[PDB]
Design a protein around this ligand. Sequence first.
Ligand code: CA
Ligand code: ZN
Lengths: 410, 349, 121, 80, 183, 279, 168
Amino acid sequence: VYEATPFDPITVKPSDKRRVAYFYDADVGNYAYGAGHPMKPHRIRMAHSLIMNYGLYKKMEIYRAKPATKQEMCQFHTDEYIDFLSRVTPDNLEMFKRESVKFNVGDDCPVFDGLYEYCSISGGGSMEGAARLNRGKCDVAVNYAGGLHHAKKSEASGFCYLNDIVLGIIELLRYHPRVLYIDIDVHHGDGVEEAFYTTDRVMTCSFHKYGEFFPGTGELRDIGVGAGKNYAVNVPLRDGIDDATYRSVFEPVIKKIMEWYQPSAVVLQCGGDSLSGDRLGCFNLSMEGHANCVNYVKSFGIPMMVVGGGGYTMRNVARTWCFETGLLNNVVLDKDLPYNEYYEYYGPDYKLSVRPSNMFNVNTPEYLDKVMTNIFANLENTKYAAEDLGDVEEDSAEAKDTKGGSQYAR
Amino acid sequence: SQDILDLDDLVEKVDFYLGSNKELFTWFKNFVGYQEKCEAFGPSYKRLPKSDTFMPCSGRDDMCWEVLNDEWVGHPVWASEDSGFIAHRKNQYEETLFKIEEERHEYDFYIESNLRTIQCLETIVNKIENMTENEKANFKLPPGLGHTSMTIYKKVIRKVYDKERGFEIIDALHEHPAVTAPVVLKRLKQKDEEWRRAQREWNKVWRELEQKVFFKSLDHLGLTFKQADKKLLTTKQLISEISSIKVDQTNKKIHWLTPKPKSQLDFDFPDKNIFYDILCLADTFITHTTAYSNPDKERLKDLLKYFISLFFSISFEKIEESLYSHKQNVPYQQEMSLLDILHRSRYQK
Amino acid sequence: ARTKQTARKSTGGKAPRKQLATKAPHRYRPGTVALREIRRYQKSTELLIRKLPFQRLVREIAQDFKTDLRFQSSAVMALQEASEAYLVALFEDTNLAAIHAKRVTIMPKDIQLARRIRGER
Amino acid sequence: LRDNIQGITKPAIRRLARRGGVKRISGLIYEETRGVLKVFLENVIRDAVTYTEHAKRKTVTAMDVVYALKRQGRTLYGFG
Amino acid sequence: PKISLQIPIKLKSVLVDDWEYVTKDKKICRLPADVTVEMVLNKYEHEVSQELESPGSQSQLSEYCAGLKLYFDKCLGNMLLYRLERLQYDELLKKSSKDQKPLVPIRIYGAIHLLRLISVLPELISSTTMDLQSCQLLIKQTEDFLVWLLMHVDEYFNDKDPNRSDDALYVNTSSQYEGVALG
Amino acid sequence: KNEHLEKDSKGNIIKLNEPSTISEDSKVSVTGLPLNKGPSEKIKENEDFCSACNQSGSFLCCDTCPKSFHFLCLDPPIDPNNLPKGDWHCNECKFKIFINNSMATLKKIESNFIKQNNNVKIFAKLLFNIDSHNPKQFQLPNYIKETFPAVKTGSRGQYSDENDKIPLTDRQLFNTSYGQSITKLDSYNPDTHIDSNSGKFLICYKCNQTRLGSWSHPENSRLIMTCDYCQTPWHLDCVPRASFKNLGSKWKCPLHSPTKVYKKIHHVNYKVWKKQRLI
Amino acid sequence: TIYERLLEIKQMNERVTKEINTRSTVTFAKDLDLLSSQLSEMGLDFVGEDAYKQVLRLSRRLINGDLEHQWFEESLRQAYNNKAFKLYTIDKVTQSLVKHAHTLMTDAKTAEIMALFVKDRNASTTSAKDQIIYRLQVRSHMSNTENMFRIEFDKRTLHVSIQYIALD
Ligand SMILES: [Ca+2]
Ligand SMILES: [Zn+2]
């Protein structure tokens, strides 16, 4: 059921005029993982710096989510794990040796200074994004600071300490009976899939590279257990997927899910790793082929939340996150960067484009038909049917932020 | 037949054997009585015991208990079969854009983290000069200096002021800011000016290096092409390739019963003007080449024009104008048959 | 008590963790062939030290004296034919020292003595 | 080029000493010879570079190594 | 010298499977098992006591059962635990002190751990200095026990998938339990 | 040729310290300019292995003898947070110390133990001896592992079977030219579609074709791998299969009999059958 | 092989030629000196000509030896978005084609094959048996081991079909 079709230019849908809410906490740029570490929270700041110069702040509503408390972080993570995060600092690593092995923290996911604060910025950012959708204040929430989908209940994996998406989804689940989670990061979203595997209230459709690629889970046969059987949907893609082939897979599958299992809300994790040129991911997706994924899910008309997730090349992910923020606001951005503080990065033509590479596309139409056939076989079973709650406090950040980002330097 | 294997599982396994012979497999499905139209656990996830699921969570509502998963767990060290993973290989040049990226971040992280302290202290410092000197005596700053982030202003002061010495600065900054904040702000601006002056000098180094090696980083196949071609364009593989198609049409004949057809390989030539383009290319190389002796090169030039004009029905005179024009860009013609060209003895006549 | 330490803090070993710390009949009696190996060498003049492993040894030494040197392919030879000879002389002197000590097998005692007596220490 | 002195093999030394005249070579030589050869080159090169570094050249040519060897007393013939 | 102990193949195939679950599959046995080393020997001592008539052998039997229990308590800590199971053993000691009752391994551990002690009995015998007539006394007596264990292998060693039954003798290990035990 | 901070809190602060800013940052010194810009510019006593495990980790070292132990291995286990104060000894050294300097002949010490417990007498020596040895990790005696030819001890003491693929040489994983990656044949290797020894083409079982495509058009090529037991080539498409699986374990091709069967009784819910191990 | 590599360039030639001309410098990158000017000075940017005709007169310089290899390649990287990587060995494939064409004049056994072909290709009226006559004579010149090919041409549809033959 895989029909190869050439890519079409991204067209904006005038039917939907969603009022977006953008969550930017100005501090989230100032945390650094290590000397050579791939995860660089700088990419949020540049992706925000570009956004303000297009004048997208005229359409969006800028918010600064109140950082997540220590208790609210525990509604997914066990109390022992969160308690370890609060105290742990580079000077304290000697005192904690049993924990640092038990909790996979500080060796690949380093214990950098400010470990707790950065995690506290991510969660209140996604959690409140769900809280605003529930109240009806915004049809979209954009929290690029968060999206860390690799963390587990008592373990930090894949650079992700606090799994905000689970915290975000649990907030949506208090109003919406069913929630759909869509993963477009090249890695398997094991952090969210393993959390919601049993329940049927969440479907975790994840696109990833299988074949002993981290975390080496997400095989096609993993479809959940117990009540949540068929309510998990993994699409194991091979190397070198590109713009035209990705659309021919993403769109048919998503269209099937939102027909058979009608979600009340979507949590779309716009992973930057899938883009071409990233240091850890191996796909050939360009921006237009990647931002089209967001435009398709938006077109359905149901409330969604966009989380940043993982992106390892600051130049590429900051460009595509700005373009995706354009599509949600019903504006297709011009292919000309505006002057911004981080201008020397986007070489060499200084245009807003992520150029697809030359690498050989290996997914074959005979293979993709067998993967998409099994999924459709399963999906025909999924017919529809100091605590703060509904944290809502938002802070109205733009008065403070307008002088940032918007540059008249010369 | 030993009642160890269920009937449905038997038919599923036989499918991998007799799948192609539809007339046979259908008979087998008819024979055993198979009728068409949980245990689907999956390979990734393993169940934990009941006791281990009791490790507490403080803020889990009743709703969270039904939704979240505690029994089933999956980890990389199990899915990897303990043998590890394979990371995607990267170019020699694509690893330069990664070295540059880190050098970019290292300068950018320290400068920007420094600015956020400058504004934090700048609003503070102006407050002191408003206050009375007696007042100045008692204006301690709570941690975070009233700012939103308690951690940022520590990692910046500790970097500048010598590691450990830096700790009693912060304590002095809280306990006695009126005389500490003006001094710390002064130096932090001074360290800002030095850091920026470096970046600009480092900006030229990074920009040109990215210019020399960017378009190579995208080019995964181009770098390895020059070596691959001479490996895969040879007298051997061009015959292995065409033979591989012949065996497929005859193999199935063994199994799928495909008839033996003609024309294993098919080519198509939609555009004529490529032929004058290839000829003028090989015309240039032949004249330039030093290996072929000058009298013989006239045959090499005259072979390609005649063979092409013969095989592809293109008139020879049309070809000669095309070469002539390409000669312009930079006395008699009897009928030279390709048959004449192929024998040296007749060629001299 | 004194406890060394653990060098690395993870159970996976980082092989499964991305950005890994650790994942990115007839026989001659003894001696009879020896002599046959000598007359097969003392009669020949071909270079004994393998060349491309020597080239990379000279470059490594040149670095800490000056950076970005470029050796003429002749001046890597002229080093090799020298350092081969230096050693062959040293080994003759050590063989003498061992024949002296009344054993046959040269040993580092013999090397160090044949250098000390030369005064080239 | 972290360790190249381990590139001068065990059969390399064994072949040399076989030319020298030995018969049985004790195991600790194969390591200890490397210690000698190394401290030989560090003297021959450090001189050859200086002749080069003087003439402003950036290439240690054979006419240098022959000179550096000459002061060592180990005069070399055949190159200049 | 070298002492030979003939373990029946079926029991010799169990152990290997136990060696696979604990080192490769990385699953450990539920420690408070249903058939512990104590009642296993309680049944065997009780089934064989009536079987044999001569009172002389009854003394030989009863002490081999009484002895094997006392030896098992001393032995389990030292050399009857794979590395991955050391932590689970530790938490039992740490639970025992809080419960204020001293841990007694024969009450806790299952029949498979008794078989581990039997497997290394020849190596333990050879290390010490014993009378030869007692060496054949233990080995013959043990070979009589293993034969009895073979007749009842079905209802001590059952192959149940831990994911499924949850009554299986082995239970999987969390990614946190495995981390500390191996790390 | 040699001959040739503290501040009066009322007062101002003495400057903390002149910043010794030699950071050796990834760029050479944060304050320093680029250096020479040559390229990049277009114009110009105790052992280290646990005596019990024989592996690495955090150790607790015996004082008398050069034997180190894990924190978990020693009996009873010792918390890394809380340790016995002062010097520590392995249970072996404690024994020798115990014996030595008191009732020194062991015999008499042991002769009391056997006489002490006459009921357990048959096990008397074995009980006494166990107090002297250090803690150990259980390893199956060789006469058990030698019964089954397939099983073999791994590098770490693991159970390694005929199923586990022999490990790839560390060079093969990380030392390859860019064009050809051994680990993944995802760069159009056409020599996969050939049988090395015989020279004929490998033919998939499902479709009875080999899809070796032209060098002109490589997208016509379909990837083929071979079973690790059967040696029957399969496309990565026919067995739906994402990749080659050359790291974890030998790939059992479909078409090979089951070695473990879970049968639902349809009335415990299930019965398990496992093939007898090869003796 | 040359025709397949060249044609796929000419098919893109209409789209690429428009794209190269219409690309514009960002004003914020032109006031400052940021955009690379290395190729513009050397002239290897397809600003003034159609892309395909320019690719030829760059290749003609490659065989002539005027243009360094790494500069010829880099010019097609920026001009064609890495799409045209196959034209990196147009100098060598041209060479191998000439070398093989040289074998046709020499190797008098092979030349005698195209001695027959020219006569057959000139024949308008060929009986069915005439082809067999043509085939059997050609088989006489090859050794009984070599495996002759059949290249078939259709004038109306410019369709060339090659059949692999290893008959008696
Ligand atoms: Ca689910
Ligand atoms: Zn990712």
